[PDB]
Each structure stands twice: as C-alpha cells, then as structure tokens.
Amino acid sequence: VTGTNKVGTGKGVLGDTKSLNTTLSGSSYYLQDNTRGATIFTYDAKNRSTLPGTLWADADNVFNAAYDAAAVDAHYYAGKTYDYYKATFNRNSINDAGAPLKSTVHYGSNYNNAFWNGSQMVYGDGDGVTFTSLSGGIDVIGHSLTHAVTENSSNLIYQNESGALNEAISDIFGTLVEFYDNRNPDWEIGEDIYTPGKAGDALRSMSDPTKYGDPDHYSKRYTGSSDNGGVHTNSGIINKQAYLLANGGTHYGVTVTGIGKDKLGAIYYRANTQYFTQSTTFSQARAGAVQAAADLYGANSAEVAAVKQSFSAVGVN
Numbered sequence: 639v640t641g642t643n644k645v646g647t648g649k650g651v652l653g654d655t656k657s658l659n660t661t662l663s664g665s666s667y668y669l670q671d672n673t674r675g676a677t678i679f680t681y682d683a684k685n686r687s688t689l690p691g692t693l694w695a696d697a698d699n700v701f702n703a704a705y706d707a708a709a710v711d712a713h714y715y716a717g718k719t720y721d722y723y724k725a726t727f728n729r730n731s732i733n734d735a736g737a738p739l740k741s742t743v744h745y746g747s748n749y750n751n752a753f754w755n756g757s758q759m760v761y762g763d764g765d766g767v768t769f770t771s772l773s774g775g776i777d778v779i780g781h782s783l784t785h786a787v788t789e790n791s792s793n794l795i796y797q798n799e800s801g802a803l804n805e806a807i808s809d810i811f812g813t814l815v816e817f818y819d820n821r822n823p824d825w826e827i828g829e830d831i832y833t834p835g836k837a838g839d840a841l842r843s844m845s846d847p848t849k850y851g852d853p854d855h856y857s858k859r860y861t862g863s864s865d866n867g868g869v870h871t872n873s874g875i876i877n878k879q880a881y882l883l884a885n886g887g888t889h890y891g892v893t894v895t896g897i898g899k900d901k902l903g904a905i906y907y908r909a910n911t912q913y914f915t916q917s918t919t920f921s922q923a924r925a926g927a928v929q930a931a932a933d934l935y936g937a938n939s940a941e942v943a944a945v946k947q948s949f950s951a952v953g954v955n
C-alpha cells in the first residue's frame with residue numbers, strides 16, 4: 639500500500655500497550671511499516687490454512703481488539719528484530735539487502751506453531767493450554783528471523799550437529815533481541831508464550847539445559863535419527879556454552895569469566911557470516927568462534943581465552 643506514515647497504538651498478546659507504525663491510505667490504516675530500511679507487512683489469515691492472507695487494515699488506527707493482539711506483537715517485534723541487526727551489525731534485513739519482512743497471524747485454527755517458512759513469518763494462535771498467540775514472544779521471533787539470517791549466510795544444514803548449531807545460534811540471538819528490547823530479559827526461550835496458565839516454565843533453558851532434559855555437555859548428547867539428529871535437544875550444548883561465555887560460571891570443573899552478551903553476539907555473528915559452513919560441526923564451531931574472537935579482540939586476548947573455556951566446559955574441544 640502507498641500512503642502516509644502514521645503511529646498507531648494497540649495492545650499486544652500480553653495486554654501491554656505498544657506503539658505501531660502504520661500507513662494511511664484512503665480511510666484505512668494498514669499494518670505496514672515504512673520507517674525502516676526494510677518494509678514490514680503484517681497479514682491476517684482469518685484462521686484459515688492460507689498464506690499470506692489479507693494485509694491488515696484498521697479504521698481508527700487503534701488496535702485494542704482482542705483479535706488485534708497477535709497482529710500488534712508480530713508487527714512490533716519484527717521491527718525490533720530488524721532494529722537489533724541494523725543497529726548492532728549494520729545489517730539491512732535478513733538478506734542484508736533490505737528484503738521486506740512479512741508476517742501472517744491467525745494462521746490455521748488453534749495451531750501451536752510459529753515459523754519462518756523461507757519467505758515469511760507464520761504464526762498460530764495456540765490452543766490456549768500449551769501456547770497463547772505465538773507472536774507474543776520476542777525471543778521466539780528473533781529465533782525464527784535469525785534462521786532467515788543463517789539461510790542468507792552460513793546456510794547450516796538442519797541435520798545433526800549443523801542443525802543443532804543452527805538452532806543454538808537462533809536461541810542465542812533470540813535472547814539477544816529480547817535483551818535489546820529489554821522485554822523482561824532472561825536466558826529462557828519462549829517463557830512469554832509457553833503454557834499461559836502455568837508460570838515459571840519455558841520451552842527450553844540456556845542457563846540450565848538439563849532443567850528440561852536437554853544436554854549441557856557433549857558427553858550427554860542425543861545420538862539418534864529422531865528430530866533430524868536431535869537438532870532441538872543437542873542445541874542445549876551450544877546454548878550452555880553461549881550462556882557461560884556471556885555470564886561466566888563454573889561448569890564441569892571449568893570456570894569461565896563472562897565477557898558480556900554484546901561480545902557474544904559479535905563473535906557469533908562474525909563466525910556465522912565469515913567462518914561457519916553448511917556442515918559445520920561443534921568442534922569446527924569452536925574453531926570458527928575462536929578465530930572470530932581472535933580477529934575482534936586479538937589472538938592473545940581474554941576473550942579468546944573465555945571462548946576456549948566455554949567450549950571445554952561443555953565438552954567441545
């Protein structure tokens with residue numbers, strides 16, 4: 639759509655007020671953001687298994703209706719994920735070429751899943767029990783757009799260790815985006831959307847992978863065909879490593895001194911864009927991460943030391 643930029647207001651999935659960038663055309667306001675280097679579109683699938691759906695249109699530029707919630711967050715958070723990458727690494731969208739960011743909410747009926755399908759974000763509204771509208775989780779969104787980022791960079795195959803690393807990178811950056819927007823920061827994934835009723839729980843833990851039965855050390859890795867080689871469980875290994883590198887701690891004898899989340903992002907972004915390949919394994923991931931930290935902070939630095947410590951702590955060498 640083509641019109642005038644406007645700033646509307648709405649309430650997200652969690653009932654919080656957010657400022658939205660909309661476009662005014664005719665007597666309607668559309669969920670179209672024209673304020674950033676990449677246009678952000680948000681569609682409505684009207685609870686049908688169709689894509690992308692109709693571009694969200696509103697009459698008064700006030701999205702406070704319950705049906706709006708999913709759209710509000712999807713539109714807002716997508717822009718925030720864009721802000722993080724642009725502000726921090728000066729990356730212009732997923733393909734570093736201004737590719738538009740489209741999102742479709744209200745997909746399917748009680749669909750408990752949200753994902754980047756290769757060209758856009760697709761969100762379900764959950765079944766109310768195990769999930770609420772999945773767009774209410776900034777870490778989940780950062781995770782998914784990062785997948786696009788990886789597709790346009792290292793292109794890690796979603797299989798075995800390459801896949802587990804692919805997932806880890808997404809978790810690391812999803813959390814980093816959560817911190818960027820100060821959206822009640824933590825190292826747990828999907829806490830804001832998982833089980834609307836039960837509080838305190840999450841999809842998985844970066845601080846303590848074993849809290850949900852995930853490997854926090856290479857020795858305890860899943861060695862089977864299921865889940866594309868345990869992609870979603872073995873990611874706990876790298877996630878723990880990432881956590882240790884950022885915050886520091888003692889794990890399996892090894893005592894790591896945290897170098898901060900900012901340096902963490904710098905190291906992984908560089909490693910993923912200038913070193914990691916499609917079949918990168920964990921040990922190779924260690925190699926690339928160390929080299930990246932070497933470039934950014936000097937071969938004989940405290941950072942490079944901490945990188946090595948983190949991997950040794952989780953059993954990768």
Ligand SMILES: [Ca+2]
Nearest residue numbers: 696698700701
């Ligand atoms: Ca309205």
Ligand SMILES: [Ca+2]
Nearest residue numbers: 821822823824
């Ligand atoms: Ca949080």
Ligand SMILES: [Ca+2]
Nearest residue numbers: 777824826827
């Ligand atoms: Ca979180």
Ligand SMILES: [Ca+2]
Nearest residue numbers: 832833836837
């Ligand atoms: Ca919960």
Ligand SMILES: [Zn+2]
Nearest residue numbers: 781785805808
């Ligand atoms: Zn993922």
